[PDB]
Amino acid sequence: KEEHVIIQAEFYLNPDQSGEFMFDFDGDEIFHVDMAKKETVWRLEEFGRFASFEAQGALANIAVDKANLEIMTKRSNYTPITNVPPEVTVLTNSPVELREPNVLICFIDKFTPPVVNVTWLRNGKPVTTGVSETVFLPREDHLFRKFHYLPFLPSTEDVYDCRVEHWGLDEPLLKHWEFDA
Amino acid sequence: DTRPRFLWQLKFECHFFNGTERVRLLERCIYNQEESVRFDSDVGEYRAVTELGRPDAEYWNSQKDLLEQRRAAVDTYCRHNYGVGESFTVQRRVEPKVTVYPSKTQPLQHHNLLVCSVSGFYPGSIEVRWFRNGQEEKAGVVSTGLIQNGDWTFQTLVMLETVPRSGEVYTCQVEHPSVTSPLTVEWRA
Amino acid sequence: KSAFYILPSIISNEK
């Protein structure tokens, strides 16, 4: 029966002291608040042309959330979170064609706490040119998902890996992708 | 770094049914991975989901002005935001790019997986059908399902188990709210 | 350019 869902999703995490505030529409991020620069970051440019958002309120909410995390930590008898390692997948946004620009997507899914280290590797070497990432996105089961992006030129000579570190994995996870004729 | 972590999440979910005709506000508190307390606008007050949440659900239910502001939020908050974002979210439309290719370069008379790649579309509601020489083929369809790319696009791969013989023509037919006429792509054996 | 609105978070039972 559902048609649409808007979620105002917030979290705070100790002892990392990391906070997040975002709006979600049917699973996609409308915007989030950059905690450091204290400002709205729109997931797509045009959003910021059609809508606006006062960050001050989001920061105030985050402060209340930190206070509540400390209260709940005490109340639970200092029960820690159980680490849930991520599922990682690597896909292309479109069918691969040699010489036609494309994008690799690293899906990091179903994990908690929301702390990960994600690096792109081409032929074993870290690549940071043109890369991007989303913030943590909420899930109905209260785990998180994340996306990393790599624009690239398909070729038969290169291999790719998304390398994901998370406290739930006792070993760094490499997810592999290559164009195979 | 092995020291324990403690997580607090607060989610406000506005659920919309038949436009903005029916709206449900669901406020949810989560400690670690355990939802402790929630406000469901259909009930109109806080409820402890676990006993950990009982102190809050009691405290917050004693605040009449808080309960009033939450009860009215379906109007001042949910319906407001739906209106603010309607034009570029509910009404976002991006047409899918469709390609059809054999998953493997195999000669005729041997089993092959024919792939219909539908990429770059929005919203996620979509229907993909396979036809062999004009006849719809319902059996042997293998699909990745709907894939959310995280950048306000979706993709899906819908594969057909075939034994292609010479002369056969396979067609992938895609229906999507972004197109008035179904998109069709052919692959000739 | 209309503005998105937030619901305020509320302190928990400290007692």
Side-chain angles (χ1 to χ4, degrees), chain A residues 2-3 6 8 10 12 16 28-29 43 75-76 79 81 139 145 149, chain B residues 5 8 10-12 14-15 19 28 31 56 77 148-150 152:
Chain A
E2 284 217 81
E3 294 186 348
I6 302 176
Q8 166 183 331
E10 313 172 17
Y12 198 86
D16 308 69
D28 284 301
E29 170 191 359
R43 186 60 180 89
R75 185 186 304 164
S76 77
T79 300
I81 192 169
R139 292 176 45 89
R145 57 174 178 174
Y149 301 105
Chain B
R5 258 69 186 178
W8 178 256
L10 173 63
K11 298 176 185 185
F12 299 104
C14 294
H15 300 256
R28 319 176 70 174
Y31 178 70
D56 299 329
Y77 170 73
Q148 203 171 24
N149 291 321
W152 290 81

PDB file of all heavy atoms in Angstrom, chain A residues 2-3 6 8 10 12 16 28-29 43 75-76 79 81 139 145 149, chain B residues 5 8 10-12 14-15 19 28 31 56 77 148-150 152:
ATOM      1  N   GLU A   2       2.095   1.161   0.480  1.00  0.00           N
ATOM      2  CA  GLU A   2       2.962   2.330   0.572  1.00  0.00           C
ATOM      3  C   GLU A   2       3.286   2.890  -0.806  1.00  0.00           C
ATOM      4  O   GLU A   2       3.402   2.157  -1.793  1.00  0.00           O
ATOM      5  CB  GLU A   2       4.280   1.973   1.257  1.00  0.00           C
ATOM      6  CG  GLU A   2       4.230   1.811   2.750  1.00  0.00           C
ATOM      7  CD  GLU A   2       5.481   2.345   3.405  1.00  0.00           C
ATOM      8  OE1 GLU A   2       5.568   3.574   3.589  1.00  0.00           O
ATOM      9  OE2 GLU A   2       6.384   1.542   3.718  1.00  0.00           O
ATOM     10  N   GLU A   3       3.413   4.211  -0.869  1.00  0.00           N
ATOM     11  CA  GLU A   3       3.914   4.885  -2.058  1.00  0.00           C
ATOM     12  C   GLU A   3       5.279   5.524  -1.854  1.00  0.00           C
ATOM     13  O   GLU A   3       6.137   5.422  -2.736  1.00  0.00           O
ATOM     14  CB  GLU A   3       2.911   5.940  -2.532  1.00  0.00           C
ATOM     15  CG  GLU A   3       1.605   5.343  -3.029  1.00  0.00           C
ATOM     16  CD  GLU A   3       0.677   6.383  -3.624  1.00  0.00           C
ATOM     17  OE1 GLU A   3       0.949   7.591  -3.447  1.00  0.00           O
ATOM     18  OE2 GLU A   3      -0.324   5.994  -4.266  1.00  0.00           O
ATOM     19  N   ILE A   6       9.716   9.341   3.621  1.00  0.00           N
ATOM     20  CA  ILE A   6      10.792  10.277   3.939  1.00  0.00           C
ATOM     21  C   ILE A   6      11.279   9.977   5.348  1.00  0.00           C
ATOM     22  O   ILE A   6      10.471   9.910   6.284  1.00  0.00           O
ATOM     23  CB  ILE A   6      10.332  11.739   3.838  1.00  0.00           C
ATOM     24  CG1 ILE A   6       9.807  12.043   2.437  1.00  0.00           C
ATOM     25  CG2 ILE A   6      11.490  12.656   4.202  1.00  0.00           C
ATOM     26  CD1 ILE A   6       9.243  13.437   2.308  1.00  0.00           C
ATOM     27  N   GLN A   8      13.983  11.268   8.321  1.00  0.00           N
ATOM     28  CA  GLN A   8      15.026  12.081   8.950  1.00  0.00           C
ATOM     29  C   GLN A   8      15.826  11.154   9.861  1.00  0.00           C
ATOM     30  O   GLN A   8      15.350  10.753  10.927  1.00  0.00           O
ATOM     31  CB  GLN A   8      14.420  13.250   9.719  1.00  0.00           C
ATOM     32  CG  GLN A   8      15.365  13.967  10.676  1.00  0.00           C
ATOM     33  CD  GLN A   8      14.649  15.065  11.435  1.00  0.00           C
ATOM     34  OE1 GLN A   8      13.689  15.633  10.933  1.00  0.00           O
ATOM     35  NE2 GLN A   8      15.083  15.335  12.670  1.00  0.00           N
ATOM     36  N   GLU A  10      19.237  10.235  12.071  1.00  0.00           N
ATOM     37  CA  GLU A  10      20.324  10.802  12.850  1.00  0.00           C
ATOM     38  C   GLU A  10      21.031   9.687  13.596  1.00  0.00           C
ATOM     39  O   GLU A  10      20.411   8.689  13.977  1.00  0.00           O
ATOM     40  CB  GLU A  10      19.821  11.829  13.871  1.00  0.00           C
ATOM     41  CG  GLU A  10      18.855  12.822  13.298  1.00  0.00           C
ATOM     42  CD  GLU A  10      18.205  13.712  14.337  1.00  0.00           C
ATOM     43  OE1 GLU A  10      18.702  13.800  15.477  1.00  0.00           O
ATOM     44  OE2 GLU A  10      17.197  14.349  14.001  1.00  0.00           O
ATOM     45  N   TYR A  12      24.556   9.181  16.580  1.00  0.00           N
ATOM     46  CA  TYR A  12      25.792   9.570  17.242  1.00  0.00           C
ATOM     47  C   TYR A  12      26.484   8.319  17.767  1.00  0.00           C
ATOM     48  O   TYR A  12      25.820   7.385  18.229  1.00  0.00           O
ATOM     49  CB  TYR A  12      25.550  10.560  18.385  1.00  0.00           C
ATOM     50  CG  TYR A  12      26.800  11.299  18.803  1.00  0.00           C
ATOM     51  CD1 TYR A  12      27.196  12.460  18.147  1.00  0.00           C
ATOM     52  CD2 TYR A  12      27.590  10.837  19.851  1.00  0.00           C
ATOM     53  CE1 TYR A  12      28.346  13.140  18.522  1.00  0.00           C
ATOM     54  CE2 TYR A  12      28.736  11.508  20.232  1.00  0.00           C
ATOM     55  CZ  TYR A  12      29.110  12.659  19.566  1.00  0.00           C
ATOM     56  OH  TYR A  12      30.250  13.330  19.947  1.00  0.00           O
ATOM     57  N   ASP A  16      33.977   7.113  19.306  1.00  0.00           N
ATOM     58  CA  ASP A  16      34.438   7.787  18.099  1.00  0.00           C
ATOM     59  C   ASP A  16      34.011   9.241  18.062  1.00  0.00           C
ATOM     60  O   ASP A  16      34.649  10.040  17.368  1.00  0.00           O
ATOM     61  CB  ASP A  16      33.905   7.083  16.853  1.00  0.00           C
ATOM     62  CG  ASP A  16      34.180   5.601  16.861  1.00  0.00           C
ATOM     63  OD1 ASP A  16      33.574   4.891  17.691  1.00  0.00           O
ATOM     64  OD2 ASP A  16      35.006   5.149  16.040  1.00  0.00           O
ATOM     65  N   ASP A  28      16.934   6.899  -1.049  1.00  0.00           N
ATOM     66  CA  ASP A  28      17.958   7.758  -1.617  1.00  0.00           C
ATOM     67  C   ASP A  28      18.121   9.018  -0.783  1.00  0.00           C
ATOM     68  O   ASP A  28      17.144   9.576  -0.275  1.00  0.00           O
ATOM     69  CB  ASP A  28      17.620   8.102  -3.063  1.00  0.00           C
ATOM     70  CG  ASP A  28      17.910   6.949  -3.996  1.00  0.00           C
ATOM     71  OD1 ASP A  28      19.087   6.533  -4.025  1.00  0.00           O
ATOM     72  OD2 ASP A  28      16.984   6.446  -4.672  1.00  0.00           O
ATOM     73  N   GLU A  29      19.366   9.467  -0.664  1.00  0.00           N
ATOM     74  CA  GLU A  29      19.696  10.618   0.162  1.00  0.00           C
ATOM     75  C   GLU A  29      19.319  11.901  -0.561  1.00  0.00           C
ATOM     76  O   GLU A  29      19.730  12.124  -1.702  1.00  0.00           O
ATOM     77  CB  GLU A  29      21.190  10.609   0.497  1.00  0.00           C
ATOM     78  CG  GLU A  29      21.696  11.894   1.154  1.00  0.00           C
ATOM     79  CD  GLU A  29      23.214  11.953   1.223  1.00  0.00           C
ATOM     80  OE1 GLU A  29      23.871  10.984   0.777  1.00  0.00           O
ATOM     81  OE2 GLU A  29      23.750  12.968   1.723  1.00  0.00           O
ATOM     82  N   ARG A  43      22.675  15.899  -2.079  1.00  0.00           N
ATOM     83  CA  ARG A  43      23.111  14.714  -2.802  1.00  0.00           C
ATOM     84  C   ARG A  43      23.218  14.993  -4.295  1.00  0.00           C
ATOM     85  O   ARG A  43      24.161  14.539  -4.954  1.00  0.00           O
ATOM     86  CB  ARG A  43      22.160  13.556  -2.536  1.00  0.00           C
ATOM     87  CG  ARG A  43      22.626  12.231  -3.151  1.00  0.00           C
ATOM     88  CD  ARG A  43      23.982  11.808  -2.598  1.00  0.00           C
ATOM     89  NE  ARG A  43      24.435  10.546  -3.161  1.00  0.00           N
ATOM     90  CZ  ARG A  43      25.153  10.440  -4.273  1.00  0.00           C
ATOM     91  NH1 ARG A  43      25.495  11.506  -4.979  1.00  0.00           N
ATOM     92  NH2 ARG A  43      25.557   9.236  -4.676  1.00  0.00           N
ATOM     93  N   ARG A  75      22.521   3.507  31.002  1.00  0.00           N
ATOM     94  CA  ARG A  75      21.312   2.759  31.354  1.00  0.00           C
ATOM     95  C   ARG A  75      21.398   1.285  30.965  1.00  0.00           C
ATOM     96  O   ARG A  75      20.834   0.430  31.655  1.00  0.00           O
ATOM     97  CB  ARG A  75      20.079   3.398  30.705  1.00  0.00           C
ATOM     98  CG  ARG A  75      18.763   2.732  31.121  1.00  0.00           C
ATOM     99  CD  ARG A  75      17.551   3.271  30.358  1.00  0.00           C
ATOM    100  NE  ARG A  75      17.392   4.717  30.465  1.00  0.00           N
ATOM    101  CZ  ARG A  75      16.615   5.437  29.668  1.00  0.00           C
ATOM    102  NH1 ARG A  75      15.934   4.880  28.680  1.00  0.00           N
ATOM    103  NH2 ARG A  75      16.524   6.751  29.862  1.00  0.00           N
ATOM    104  N   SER A  76      22.073   0.963  29.864  1.00  0.00           N
ATOM    105  CA  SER A  76      22.160  -0.414  29.391  1.00  0.00           C
ATOM    106  C   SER A  76      23.198  -1.249  30.127  1.00  0.00           C
ATOM    107  O   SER A  76      23.429  -2.395  29.724  1.00  0.00           O
ATOM    108  CB  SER A  76      22.481  -0.449  27.898  1.00  0.00           C
ATOM    109  OG  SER A  76      23.849  -0.168  27.660  1.00  0.00           O
ATOM    110  N   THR A  79      26.394  -1.823  27.607  1.00  0.00           N
ATOM    111  CA  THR A  79      26.321  -2.877  26.610  1.00  0.00           C
ATOM    112  C   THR A  79      26.865  -2.376  25.278  1.00  0.00           C
ATOM    113  O   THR A  79      26.296  -1.443  24.701  1.00  0.00           O
ATOM    114  CB  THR A  79      24.888  -3.359  26.449  1.00  0.00           C
ATOM    115  OG1 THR A  79      24.419  -3.858  27.707  1.00  0.00           O
ATOM    116  CG2 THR A  79      24.807  -4.468  25.403  1.00  0.00           C
ATOM    117  N   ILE A  81      27.852  -2.425  21.165  1.00  0.00           N
ATOM    118  CA  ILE A  81      27.229  -2.900  19.941  1.00  0.00           C
ATOM    119  C   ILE A  81      27.965  -4.144  19.460  1.00  0.00           C
ATOM    120  O   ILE A  81      29.180  -4.290  19.666  1.00  0.00           O
ATOM    121  CB  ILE A  81      27.245  -1.787  18.881  1.00  0.00           C
ATOM    122  CG1 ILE A  81      26.337  -2.157  17.707  1.00  0.00           C
ATOM    123  CG2 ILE A  81      28.687  -1.530  18.418  1.00  0.00           C
ATOM    124  CD1 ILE A  81      26.070  -1.021  16.720  1.00  0.00           C
ATOM    125  N   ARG A 139      19.110   1.832   7.233  1.00  0.00           N
ATOM    126  CA  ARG A 139      18.413   0.639   6.787  1.00  0.00           C
ATOM    127  C   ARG A 139      17.293   0.354   7.769  1.00  0.00           C
ATOM    128  O   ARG A 139      17.331   0.793   8.923  1.00  0.00           O
ATOM    129  CB  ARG A 139      19.338  -0.590   6.704  1.00  0.00           C
ATOM    130  CG  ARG A 139      20.421  -0.553   5.615  1.00  0.00           C
ATOM    131  CD  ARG A 139      21.306  -1.785   5.709  1.00  0.00           C
ATOM    132  NE  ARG A 139      20.509  -2.991   5.901  1.00  0.00           N
ATOM    133  CZ  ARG A 139      20.018  -3.736   4.917  1.00  0.00           C
ATOM    134  NH1 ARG A 139      20.282  -3.469   3.645  1.00  0.00           N
ATOM    135  NH2 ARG A 139      19.239  -4.773   5.215  1.00  0.00           N
ATOM    136  N   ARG A 145      24.215   1.298   5.029  1.00  0.00           N
ATOM    137  CA  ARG A 145      24.794   1.030   3.726  1.00  0.00           C
ATOM    138  C   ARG A 145      25.553   2.267   3.273  1.00  0.00           C
ATOM    139  O   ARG A 145      25.415   3.346   3.842  1.00  0.00           O
ATOM    140  CB  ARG A 145      23.744   0.592   2.688  1.00  0.00           C
ATOM    141  CG  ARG A 145      22.604   1.542   2.467  1.00  0.00           C
ATOM    142  CD  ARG A 145      21.725   1.055   1.318  1.00  0.00           C
ATOM    143  NE  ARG A 145      20.579   1.939   1.130  1.00  0.00           N
ATOM    144  CZ  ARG A 145      19.705   1.842   0.137  1.00  0.00           C
ATOM    145  NH1 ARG A 145      19.814   0.905  -0.793  1.00  0.00           N
ATOM    146  NH2 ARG A 145      18.699   2.709   0.073  1.00  0.00           N
ATOM    147  N   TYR A 149      32.351   5.201  -5.474  1.00  0.00           N
ATOM    148  CA  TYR A 149      32.245   5.348  -6.915  1.00  0.00           C
ATOM    149  C   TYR A 149      33.616   5.565  -7.540  1.00  0.00           C
ATOM    150  O   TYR A 149      34.444   6.306  -7.003  1.00  0.00           O
ATOM    151  CB  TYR A 149      31.321   6.520  -7.263  1.00  0.00           C
ATOM    152  CG  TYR A 149      29.917   6.377  -6.717  1.00  0.00           C
ATOM    153  CD1 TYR A 149      29.492   7.117  -5.619  1.00  0.00           C
ATOM    154  CD2 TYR A 149      29.008   5.508  -7.312  1.00  0.00           C
ATOM    155  CE1 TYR A 149      28.197   6.992  -5.129  1.00  0.00           C
ATOM    156  CE2 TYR A 149      27.718   5.376  -6.832  1.00  0.00           C
ATOM    157  CZ  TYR A 149      27.318   6.118  -5.743  1.00  0.00           C
ATOM    158  OH  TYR A 149      26.037   5.974  -5.273  1.00  0.00           O
TER     159      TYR A 149
ATOM    160  N   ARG B   5      32.106  -0.039  21.163  1.00  0.00           N
ATOM    161  CA  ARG B   5      31.341   1.045  20.571  1.00  0.00           C
ATOM    162  C   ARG B   5      29.909   1.011  21.085  1.00  0.00           C
ATOM    163  O   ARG B   5      29.361  -0.055  21.379  1.00  0.00           O
ATOM    164  CB  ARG B   5      31.338   0.952  19.044  1.00  0.00           C
ATOM    165  CG  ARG B   5      32.298   1.913  18.387  1.00  0.00           C
ATOM    166  CD  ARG B   5      33.729   1.519  18.673  1.00  0.00           C
ATOM    167  NE  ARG B   5      34.661   2.520  18.172  1.00  0.00           N
ATOM    168  CZ  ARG B   5      35.977   2.456  18.310  1.00  0.00           C
ATOM    169  NH1 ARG B   5      36.559   1.443  18.935  1.00  0.00           N
ATOM    170  NH2 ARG B   5      36.728   3.436  17.817  1.00  0.00           N
ATOM    171  N   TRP B   8      23.698   5.331  19.053  1.00  0.00           N
ATOM    172  CA  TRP B   8      22.348   5.851  19.239  1.00  0.00           C
ATOM    173  C   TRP B   8      21.835   6.392  17.912  1.00  0.00           C
ATOM    174  O   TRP B   8      22.498   7.219  17.272  1.00  0.00           O
ATOM    175  CB  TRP B   8      22.312   6.956  20.300  1.00  0.00           C
ATOM    176  CG  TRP B   8      20.942   7.587  20.514  1.00  0.00           C
ATOM    177  CD1 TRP B   8      20.523   8.804  20.063  1.00  0.00           C
ATOM    178  CD2 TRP B   8      19.848   7.046  21.274  1.00  0.00           C
ATOM    179  NE1 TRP B   8      19.231   9.043  20.466  1.00  0.00           N
ATOM    180  CE2 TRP B   8      18.795   7.981  21.215  1.00  0.00           C
ATOM    181  CE3 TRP B   8      19.653   5.857  21.987  1.00  0.00           C
ATOM    182  CZ2 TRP B   8      17.567   7.765  21.844  1.00  0.00           C
ATOM    183  CZ3 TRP B   8      18.432   5.644  22.610  1.00  0.00           C
ATOM    184  CH2 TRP B   8      17.408   6.595  22.538  1.00  0.00           C
ATOM    185  N   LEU B  10      18.300   8.004  15.899  1.00  0.00           N
ATOM    186  CA  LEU B  10      16.964   8.580  15.957  1.00  0.00           C
ATOM    187  C   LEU B  10      16.471   8.718  14.530  1.00  0.00           C
ATOM    188  O   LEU B  10      17.133   9.359  13.709  1.00  0.00           O
ATOM    189  CB  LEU B  10      16.987   9.932  16.667  1.00  0.00           C
ATOM    190  CG  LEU B  10      15.669  10.704  16.631  1.00  0.00           C
ATOM    191  CD1 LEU B  10      14.565   9.954  17.357  1.00  0.00           C
ATOM    192  CD2 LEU B  10      15.888  12.067  17.229  1.00  0.00           C
ATOM    193  N   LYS B  11      15.329   8.105  14.229  1.00  0.00           N
ATOM    194  CA  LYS B  11      14.747   8.155  12.893  1.00  0.00           C
ATOM    195  C   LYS B  11      13.321   8.692  12.970  1.00  0.00           C
ATOM    196  O   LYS B  11      12.525   8.228  13.786  1.00  0.00           O
ATOM    197  CB  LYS B  11      14.753   6.769  12.242  1.00  0.00           C
ATOM    198  CG  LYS B  11      16.162   6.174  12.044  1.00  0.00           C
ATOM    199  CD  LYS B  11      16.096   4.763  11.477  1.00  0.00           C
ATOM    200  CE  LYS B  11      17.476   4.113  11.389  1.00  0.00           C
ATOM    201  NZ  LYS B  11      17.323   2.807  10.729  1.00  0.00           N
ATOM    202  N   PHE B  12      13.000   9.666  12.123  1.00  0.00           N
ATOM    203  CA  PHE B  12      11.625  10.121  11.932  1.00  0.00           C
ATOM    204  C   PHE B  12      11.198   9.674  10.538  1.00  0.00           C
ATOM    205  O   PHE B  12      11.781  10.109   9.542  1.00  0.00           O
ATOM    206  CB  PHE B  12      11.509  11.637  12.083  1.00  0.00           C
ATOM    207  CG  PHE B  12      11.909  12.153  13.441  1.00  0.00           C
ATOM    208  CD1 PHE B  12      13.125  12.794  13.621  1.00  0.00           C
ATOM    209  CD2 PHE B  12      11.049  12.059  14.518  1.00  0.00           C
ATOM    210  CE1 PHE B  12      13.489  13.296  14.857  1.00  0.00           C
ATOM    211  CE2 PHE B  12      11.409  12.561  15.767  1.00  0.00           C
ATOM    212  CZ  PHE B  12      12.627  13.178  15.935  1.00  0.00           C
ATOM    213  N   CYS B  14       8.263   9.466   7.758  1.00  0.00           N
ATOM    214  CA  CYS B  14       6.963   9.906   7.265  1.00  0.00           C
ATOM    215  C   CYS B  14       6.553   8.936   6.166  1.00  0.00           C
ATOM    216  O   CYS B  14       7.225   8.846   5.133  1.00  0.00           O
ATOM    217  CB  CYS B  14       7.023  11.343   6.753  1.00  0.00           C
ATOM    218  SG  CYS B  14       7.357  12.587   8.022  1.00  0.00           S
ATOM    219  N   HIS B  15       5.490   8.172   6.412  1.00  0.00           N
ATOM    220  CA  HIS B  15       4.948   7.242   5.434  1.00  0.00           C
ATOM    221  C   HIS B  15       3.725   7.858   4.767  1.00  0.00           C
ATOM    222  O   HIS B  15       2.803   8.320   5.453  1.00  0.00           O
ATOM    223  CB  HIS B  15       4.579   5.913   6.087  1.00  0.00           C
ATOM    224  CG  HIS B  15       5.734   5.220   6.737  1.00  0.00           C
ATOM    225  ND1 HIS B  15       6.356   4.126   6.173  1.00  0.00           N
ATOM    226  CD2 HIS B  15       6.383   5.464   7.899  1.00  0.00           C
ATOM    227  CE1 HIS B  15       7.341   3.729   6.958  1.00  0.00           C
ATOM    228  NE2 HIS B  15       7.377   4.522   8.013  1.00  0.00           N
ATOM    229  N   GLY B  19      -0.776   9.509  -2.369  1.00  0.00           N
ATOM    230  CA  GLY B  19      -0.375  10.899  -2.290  1.00  0.00           C
ATOM    231  C   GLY B  19      -0.079  11.295  -0.858  1.00  0.00           C
ATOM    232  O   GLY B  19       0.754  10.667  -0.201  1.00  0.00           O
ATOM    233  N   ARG B  28      11.452   6.742  15.936  1.00  0.00           N
ATOM    234  CA  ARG B  28      12.091   5.525  16.420  1.00  0.00           C
ATOM    235  C   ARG B  28      13.440   5.841  17.038  1.00  0.00           C
ATOM    236  O   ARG B  28      14.279   6.493  16.403  1.00  0.00           O
ATOM    237  CB  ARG B  28      12.284   4.519  15.281  1.00  0.00           C
ATOM    238  CG  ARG B  28      11.089   4.447  14.359  1.00  0.00           C
ATOM    239  CD  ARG B  28      11.353   3.532  13.205  1.00  0.00           C
ATOM    240  NE  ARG B  28      11.410   2.142  13.627  1.00  0.00           N
ATOM    241  CZ  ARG B  28      11.507   1.125  12.785  1.00  0.00           C
ATOM    242  NH1 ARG B  28      11.546   1.316  11.478  1.00  0.00           N
ATOM    243  NH2 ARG B  28      11.560  -0.113  13.266  1.00  0.00           N
ATOM    244  N   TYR B  31      19.080   1.903  20.232  1.00  0.00           N
ATOM    245  CA  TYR B  31      20.358   1.783  20.914  1.00  0.00           C
ATOM    246  C   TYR B  31      21.085   0.580  20.328  1.00  0.00           C
ATOM    247  O   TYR B  31      20.541  -0.532  20.318  1.00  0.00           O
ATOM    248  CB  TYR B  31      20.185   1.641  22.423  1.00  0.00           C
ATOM    249  CG  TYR B  31      21.491   1.457  23.156  1.00  0.00           C
ATOM    250  CD1 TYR B  31      22.405   2.497  23.261  1.00  0.00           C
ATOM    251  CD2 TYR B  31      21.804   0.246  23.752  1.00  0.00           C
ATOM    252  CE1 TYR B  31      23.605   2.327  23.932  1.00  0.00           C
ATOM    253  CE2 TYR B  31      22.992   0.066  24.422  1.00  0.00           C
ATOM    254  CZ  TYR B  31      23.888   1.108  24.513  1.00  0.00           C
ATOM    255  OH  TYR B  31      25.066   0.919  25.194  1.00  0.00           O
ATOM    256  N   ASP B  56      11.988   6.137  28.994  1.00  0.00           N
ATOM    257  CA  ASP B  56      11.766   7.275  28.104  1.00  0.00           C
ATOM    258  C   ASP B  56      10.300   7.385  27.695  1.00  0.00           C
ATOM    259  O   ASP B  56       9.692   8.454  27.819  1.00  0.00           O
ATOM    260  CB  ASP B  56      12.658   7.166  26.868  1.00  0.00           C
ATOM    261  CG  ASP B  56      14.133   7.179  27.219  1.00  0.00           C
ATOM    262  OD1 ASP B  56      14.496   7.820  28.226  1.00  0.00           O
ATOM    263  OD2 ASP B  56      14.931   6.564  26.480  1.00  0.00           O
ATOM    264  N   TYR B  77       4.943  18.782   9.494  1.00  0.00           N
ATOM    265  CA  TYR B  77       6.256  18.227   9.201  1.00  0.00           C
ATOM    266  C   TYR B  77       6.219  17.296   8.000  1.00  0.00           C
ATOM    267  O   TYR B  77       6.865  17.580   6.986  1.00  0.00           O
ATOM    268  CB  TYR B  77       6.784  17.514  10.458  1.00  0.00           C
ATOM    269  CG  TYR B  77       8.030  16.669  10.273  1.00  0.00           C
ATOM    270  CD1 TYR B  77       9.277  17.257  10.089  1.00  0.00           C
ATOM    271  CD2 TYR B  77       7.962  15.282  10.325  1.00  0.00           C
ATOM    272  CE1 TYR B  77      10.418  16.487   9.940  1.00  0.00           C
ATOM    273  CE2 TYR B  77       9.104  14.502  10.178  1.00  0.00           C
ATOM    274  CZ  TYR B  77      10.321  15.115   9.986  1.00  0.00           C
ATOM    275  OH  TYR B  77      11.442  14.359   9.837  1.00  0.00           O
ATOM    276  N   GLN B 148      19.652  -0.406  -6.424  1.00  0.00           N
ATOM    277  CA  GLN B 148      19.701   1.025  -6.154  1.00  0.00           C
ATOM    278  C   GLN B 148      21.159   1.471  -6.182  1.00  0.00           C
ATOM    279  O   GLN B 148      21.974   0.993  -5.388  1.00  0.00           O
ATOM    280  CB  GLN B 148      19.041   1.347  -4.808  1.00  0.00           C
ATOM    281  CG  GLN B 148      18.532   2.778  -4.667  1.00  0.00           C
ATOM    282  CD  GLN B 148      17.704   2.993  -3.400  1.00  0.00           C
ATOM    283  OE1 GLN B 148      17.851   2.269  -2.417  1.00  0.00           O
ATOM    284  NE2 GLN B 148      16.826   4.009  -3.423  1.00  0.00           N
ATOM    285  N   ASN B 149      21.486   2.384  -7.092  1.00  0.00           N
ATOM    286  CA  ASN B 149      22.870   2.783  -7.292  1.00  0.00           C
ATOM    287  C   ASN B 149      23.368   3.797  -6.275  1.00  0.00           C
ATOM    288  O   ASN B 149      24.574   4.072  -6.249  1.00  0.00           O
ATOM    289  CB  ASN B 149      23.042   3.336  -8.703  1.00  0.00           C
ATOM    290  CG  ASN B 149      22.901   2.261  -9.761  1.00  0.00           C
ATOM    291  OD1 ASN B 149      23.376   1.133  -9.582  1.00  0.00           O
ATOM    292  ND2 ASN B 149      22.226   2.589 -10.858  1.00  0.00           N
ATOM    293  N   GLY B 150      22.490   4.349  -5.435  1.00  0.00           N
ATOM    294  CA  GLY B 150      22.893   5.334  -4.455  1.00  0.00           C
ATOM    295  C   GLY B 150      22.984   6.745  -4.976  1.00  0.00           C
ATOM    296  O   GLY B 150      23.275   7.661  -4.199  1.00  0.00           O
ATOM    297  N   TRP B 152      20.416   8.188  -6.994  1.00  0.00           N
ATOM    298  CA  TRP B 152      19.072   8.452  -7.518  1.00  0.00           C
ATOM    299  C   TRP B 152      18.866   7.840  -8.899  1.00  0.00           C
ATOM    300  O   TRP B 152      18.107   8.372  -9.718  1.00  0.00           O
ATOM    301  CB  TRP B 152      18.752   9.955  -7.541  1.00  0.00           C
ATOM    302  CG  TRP B 152      18.562  10.552  -6.176  1.00  0.00           C
ATOM    303  CD1 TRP B 152      19.543  10.951  -5.315  1.00  0.00           C
ATOM    304  CD2 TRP B 152      17.318  10.826  -5.519  1.00  0.00           C
ATOM    305  NE1 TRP B 152      18.990  11.451  -4.161  1.00  0.00           N
ATOM    306  CE2 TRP B 152      17.625  11.387  -4.261  1.00  0.00           C
ATOM    307  CE3 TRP B 152      15.975  10.654  -5.871  1.00  0.00           C
ATOM    308  CZ2 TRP B 152      16.636  11.775  -3.352  1.00  0.00           C
ATOM    309  CZ3 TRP B 152      14.992  11.041  -4.968  1.00  0.00           C
ATOM    310  CH2 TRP B 152      15.330  11.595  -3.724  1.00  0.00           C
TER     311      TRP B 152
END
